[PDB]
Amino acid sequence: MAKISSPTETERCIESLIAVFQKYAGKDGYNYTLSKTEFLSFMNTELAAFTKNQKDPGVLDRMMKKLDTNSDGQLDFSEFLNLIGGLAMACHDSFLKAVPSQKRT
Amino acid sequence: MAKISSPTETERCIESLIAVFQKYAGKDGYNYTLSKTEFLSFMNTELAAFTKNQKDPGVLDRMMKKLDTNSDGQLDFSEFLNLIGGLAMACHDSFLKAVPSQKRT
């Protein structure tokens, strides 16, 4: 069985975001939107790498309100992904400042 | 060993995007930007789920020019992630039109 991965690395990444997003956003039960405290818990757990590396949880506050383009105080599908964009760009930048030659053969 | 995953599901998703992005974008060797043909190959391989489900590869053309905010004809870190946003939103929407109760305990 060569095709063990129905999704690819990006697609599975995407379904990962589905998993993590919908489990935390699914706590507030609004419109599958990641509420303030849900995102606080989210970022301190699922993004503790970033969150705890910052300095104080007030950053999650800055994240939320930056991404909260719906201006409801929650992060929807795209708002969470906007986040993922900045997150990815931070880790990418890490690689660019380290070794971005991730040319996996 | 409980902490076998240094990255979380979102963080690993993010490093996945690093992996897939930098391997294809690393083919053009510009500024780690996913060039037209590199993205064509990318989307037909890594996103064949979406690409082949559309109808014709001219869609990748539409993706590129939508995401090519750098207006160079390539997708950078954020432009690829803009893509990932629309991709994720499509798969999310799939779940929302199916079963978005991905409340993994």
- Residue A37 belongs to domain spanning: 1-105
B14/A13 Cβ within 8 A: yes
B54 labeled binding residue: no
CATH of the domain at A24: 1.10.238.10
Question: CA nearest B65: which of B98, B103, B39, B100?
Answer: B39
Cα A45 to Cα A94, B40, B47, B59, distances in angstroms: 20, 36, 29, 37
Spatial CA neighbour of A63 closest among A92, A30, A73: A73
In chain B, the number of structural domains is 1
Which amino acid belongs to residue B69? T
What is the spatial distance between Cα B57 and Cα B72, in angstroms, rounded to a whole number? 20
> Hey, is the C-beta of B31 within 8 angstroms of any chain A C-beta?
no
Give the minimum alpha-carbon distance from B79 to chain A in angstroms, rounded to a whole number. 9
Partners of A77 on chain B (C-beta within 8 Å) are 88-89, 92-93
Neighbour tally for A51: CB within 10 Å: 19
Count of Cβ atoms closer than 10 Å to residue A49 Cβ: 17
* Residue B27, SS3 per DSSP: helix
Cβ atoms of residues B91 and A18 within 8 Å: yes
